[PDB]
Amino acid sequence: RKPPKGMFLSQEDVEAVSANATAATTVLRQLDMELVSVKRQIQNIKQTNSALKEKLDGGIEPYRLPEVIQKCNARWTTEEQLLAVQAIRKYGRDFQAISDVIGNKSVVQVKNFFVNYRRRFNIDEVLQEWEAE
Amino acid sequence: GVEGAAFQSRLPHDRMTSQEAACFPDIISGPQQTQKVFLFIRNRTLQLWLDNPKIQLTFEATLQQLEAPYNSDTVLVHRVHSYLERHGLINFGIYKRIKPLPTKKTGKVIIIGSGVSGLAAARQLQSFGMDVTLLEARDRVGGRVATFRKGNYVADLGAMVVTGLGGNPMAVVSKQVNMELAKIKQKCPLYEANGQAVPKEKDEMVEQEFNRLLEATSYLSHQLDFNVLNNKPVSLGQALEVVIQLQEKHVKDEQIEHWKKIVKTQEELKELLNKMVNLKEKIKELHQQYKEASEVKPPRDITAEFLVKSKHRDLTALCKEYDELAETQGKLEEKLQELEANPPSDVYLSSRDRQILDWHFANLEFANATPLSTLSLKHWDQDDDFEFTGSHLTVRNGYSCVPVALAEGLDIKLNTAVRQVRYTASGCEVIAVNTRSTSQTFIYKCDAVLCTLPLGVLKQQPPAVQFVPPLPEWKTSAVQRMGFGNLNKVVLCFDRVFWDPSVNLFGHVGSTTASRGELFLFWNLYKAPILLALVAGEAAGIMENISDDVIVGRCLAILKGIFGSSAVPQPKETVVSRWRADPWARGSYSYVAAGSSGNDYDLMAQPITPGPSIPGAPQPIPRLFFAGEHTIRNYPATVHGALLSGLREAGRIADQFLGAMYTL
Ligand SMILES: Cc1cc2c(cc1C)N1[C@H](O)C[C@@H](c3ccc(-c4ccccc4)cc3)[C@]13C(=O)NC(=O)N=C3N2C[C@H](O)[C@H](O)[C@H](O)COP(=O)(O)OP(=O)(O)OC[C@H]1O[C@@H](n2cnc3c(N)ncnc32)[C@H](O)[C@@H]1O
Numbered sequence A: 001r002k003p004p005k006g007m008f009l010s011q012e013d014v015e016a017v018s019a020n021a022t023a024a025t026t027v028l029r030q031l032d033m034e035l036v037s038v039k040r041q042i043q044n045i046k047q048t049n050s051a052l053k054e055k056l057d058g059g060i061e062p063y064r065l066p067e068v069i070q071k072c073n074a075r076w077t078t079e080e081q082l083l084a085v086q087a088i089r090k091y092g093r094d095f096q097a098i099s100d101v102i103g104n105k106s107v108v109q110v111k112n113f114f115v116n117y118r119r120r121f122n123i124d125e126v127l128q129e130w131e132a133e
Numbered sequence B: 001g002v003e004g005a006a007f008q009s010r011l012p013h014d015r016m017t018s019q020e021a022a023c024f025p026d027i028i029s030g031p032q033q034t035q036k037v038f039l040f041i042r043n044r045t046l047q048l049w050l051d052n053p054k055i056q057l058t059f060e061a062t063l064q065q066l067e068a069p070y071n072s073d074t075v076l077v078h079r080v081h082s083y084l085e086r087h088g089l090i091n092f093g094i095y096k097r098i099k100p101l102p103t104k105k106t107g108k109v110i111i112i113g114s115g116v117s118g119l120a121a122a123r124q125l126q127s128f129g130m131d132v133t134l135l136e137a138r139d140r141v142g143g144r145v146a147t148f149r150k151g152n153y154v155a156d157l158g159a160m161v162v163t164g165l166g167g168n169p170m171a172v173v174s175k176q177v178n179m180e181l182a183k184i185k186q187k188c189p190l191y192e193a194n195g196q197a198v199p200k201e202k203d204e205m206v207e208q209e210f211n212r213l214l215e216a217t218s219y220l221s222h223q224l225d226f227n228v229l230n231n232k233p234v235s236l237g238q239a240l241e242v243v244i245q246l247q248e249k250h251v252k253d254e255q256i257e258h259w260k261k262i263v264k265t266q267e268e269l270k271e272l273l274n275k276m277v278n279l280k281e282k283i284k285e286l287h288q289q290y291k292e293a294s295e296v297k298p299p300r301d302i303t304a305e306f307l308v309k310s311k312h313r314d315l316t317a318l319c320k321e322y323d324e325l326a327e328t329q330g331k332l333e334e335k336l337q338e339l340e341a342n343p344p345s346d347v348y349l350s351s352r353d354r355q356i357l358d359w360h361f362a363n364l365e366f367a368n369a370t371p372l373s374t375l376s377l378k379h380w381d382q383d384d385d386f387e388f389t390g391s392h393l394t395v396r397n398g399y400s401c402v403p404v405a406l407a408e409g410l411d412i413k414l415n416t417a418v419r420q421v422r423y424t425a426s427g428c429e430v431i432a433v434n435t436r437s438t439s440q441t442f443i444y445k446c447d448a449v450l451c452t453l454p455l456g457v458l459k460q461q462p463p464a465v466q467f468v469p470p471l472p473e474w475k476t477s478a479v480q481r482m483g484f485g486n487l488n489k490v491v492l493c494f495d496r497v498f499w500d501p502s503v504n505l506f507g508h509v510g511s512t513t514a515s516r517g518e519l520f521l522f523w524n525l526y527k528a529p530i531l532l533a534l535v536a537g538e539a540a541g542i543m544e545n546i547s548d549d550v551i552v553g554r555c556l557a558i559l560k561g562i563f564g565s566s567a568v569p570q571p572k573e574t575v576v577s578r579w580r581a582d583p584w585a586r587g588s589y590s591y592v593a594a595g596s597s598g599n600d601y602d603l604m605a606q607p608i609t610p611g612p613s614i615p616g617a618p619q620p621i622p623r624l625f626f627a628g629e630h631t632i633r634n635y636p637a638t639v640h641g642a643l644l645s646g647l648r649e650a651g652r653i654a655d656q657f658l659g660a661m662y663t664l
Helices: A011-018 A023-055 A078-091 A095-102 A107-116 A123-132 B002-008 B018-023 B025-029 B032-051 B059-065 B074-086 B116-127 B169-176 B200-222 B236-295 B302-339 B353-368 B382-386 B401-406 B455-459 B473-481 B537-543 B548-563 B639-657
Strands: B106-112 B130-135 B148-150 B153-155 B181-183 B393-395 B411-413 B416-424 B427-434 B441-446 B448-451 B466-468 B488-493 B505-507 B521-524 B530-535 B573-576 B624-626
Touching (some): A011 B236, A023 B236, A078 A107, A095 A107, B018 B025, B025 B032, B032 B074, B059 B074, B106 B116, B106 B427, B106 B639, B116 B401, B116 B639, B130 B441, B153 B488, B153 B530, B200 B236, B200 B353, B236 B302, B353 B521, B353 B537, B427 B448, B448 B639, B530 B537, B530 B548, B548 B573
Parallel strands (some): B416 B466
Antiparallel strands (some): B148 B153, B181 B393, B488 B530
8 A cells, every 4th residue: 555664655756757867867956956045045044143143232131120029009199190190191001001100009909090080080081092192 | 294295386285276177177166075185185196296206106106095085086086196297296307117118109209408498398208108309509408507517616607596495396306316405594794895894784774775665666566556657668677766766855855844944943033033133222212211211300290200100111011022032032042953953864875875775786686687677667576476485505516416317318419409490280390400510410300399498599680590480479579578688607716715604695895886786796605615706787798798817807806805915815717607698598597578577478388389281171289389497487587497397398298199188
């Protein structure tokens, strides 16, 4: 039924190397050149990717700043209320970012804020204008 | 048991052959029980003969030693025994005769050729009470069973291997005739052109690849039906090359898709670094912006304080992104160490490889005595189903001892070249000349002619032998289509053994594909200090154009490299054969040529029947018969196959001119 294991022998392959006298030598030079074609292209992107590695020198280590461990509180200082409305104006519905700006309000107190002070802070108008951008 | 007698007679022990159906059509069409009785009587007589083949097995002896119920029916035993004795399955070869031969002899047969097939028929026909004369162009019997002998040096230029005694008629002969049969130890060390052994690593690697490529052709043959190409039949070598190409093609497609996994990941990294460089540039800018917004001294109003917190959030956001992206950059710089460390195979075969593989093809061209370019892909190995069992042997006292043993008591005319065969509705006359003074002409008249002329002789154009009338087209076309190839031996006779004596045979690897046959193999086989060097393939037909010294030169060279330039003495005696040269052979033995089949081997064996002399007289008897190694489909190009075909035709001829009274 099937070849020895390792011999490659499709009906298709067989005719392609028989079609003429040097149809053997032919298809084995389209492959020696497909192989050089990729080999030099592999050599290319190696140096393109080697230059882009040198720009990334230093990482972002100058540029990274410390983490602020701060215990999450409950009450809303009028300060934190005002940070909130500005974060809503700049972050839409991304309750995670707003909880990072305010710093000591959980992502749910953030969501609660949206309805409690919804009236008094025109949260709706604010969101409309967020969406304009 | 009795079933072993049937195996050793090349006969299915539990079925009637087509031969036996012809002679016993009552039985094989009859009830299952009679068939078994017959089959036992058949196998039991075989066992009797086989158990002691130095004396005749008379019908009386046979019936004596059967018991009931099997010895009840005496005509069934007489029919079986007669059948056997007739077609040379018992009382063949060299046996003492109980019933000494009849004084008066029936019919007259001329036999062209004292080869082994010739002698085997002659010996049976005389055994049947016929008049048999053998015509011989050579000054010796044996034909292509040649044996060099000088002093104590002994070495066959012809056949030398008994291919193993499991069902081999030669097994019987060797009991009858003194033969010193020595097993051949199968180990063959290869030695490159330089003189250095091939390492066990390579020598196994190529050989498995060789064996693997053969099966590949066989699968191309039967499974993909790859048997015609450009309206011509495909040859073995032609398809071995297509199979090596498709493996060289595979190695390349395998590197292409692997290196193409590297570009498919190099450019993942290209895109990944480009995010990472444009992300460090956003980070570089916000850090500045957050610095300036933190520079504003408190206490701040709330928009200015939101600006510090905001830029802070936004920098921690783009710092996750860049950290995640040099996480991912870690996975891709490791996968690129992976792939660039697991390359697929560099080549399909190296020139040290393809040159040792070429030695395995020299062996296969030695086996078949022809360039692999000429063997039929479909059929070159049709005779493989009938292989014998057991070790292959050589004949240590020289294998001419067998023809000479057979020729005892026979009428042999040596130095007698047949030159015209003339067969008619009323008899035949064969015209021979004396080989020494070719003027002196001979005429032999006879009832039938048995032609054991080598296929190469029959192939010769312009003819060495003329048939009057000409052979029919169906016979001459079989003669053109069949293959008759060539191989030669160089015999090297030294005063002392300087090779590994525990190694019967050791190879030599050739530098070229073209010269793979040239002195590719050596045999220690004999008591004495004799090495024997083979010339196969395309090299066979070319070394015949080259003097003995030049050939013995290349052999001394080749051996110095392998055993050292000072352990190799001069040879005391040298013999080169040239079988395509030899006009009584014109080659070495037959091979299934591309465009031929084993069916041609059967055409070769059909007798010729001359037309009627008087128009409208009855359809005559057949007059011209053919035997010889090229006529036996299931055992071609062998000795045992010659033997067998001579046994066959002697039965055929006797059934014709003596009648076969055992078919009733
Ligand atoms: C030339 C040579 C032949 C053989 C061998 C060696 C050589 C050099 N040996 C070698 O290891 C190879 C081996 C073998 C075994 C299996 C295979 C094989 C297996 C599977 C598939 C394919 C192949 C291959 C090789 C072996 C061996 O060991 N044992 C072995 O088993 N037969 C071997 N073989 C074959 C054997 O040698 C011969 O096949 C028989 O000898 C056949 O002889 P036969 O056909 O009877 O006939 P002839 O040719 O011998 O006799 C003719 C007479 O006619 C005279 N004659 C001509 N013309 C005229 C004329 N015009 N007028 C009057 N007389 C004439 C001629 O002068 C001679 O008098």
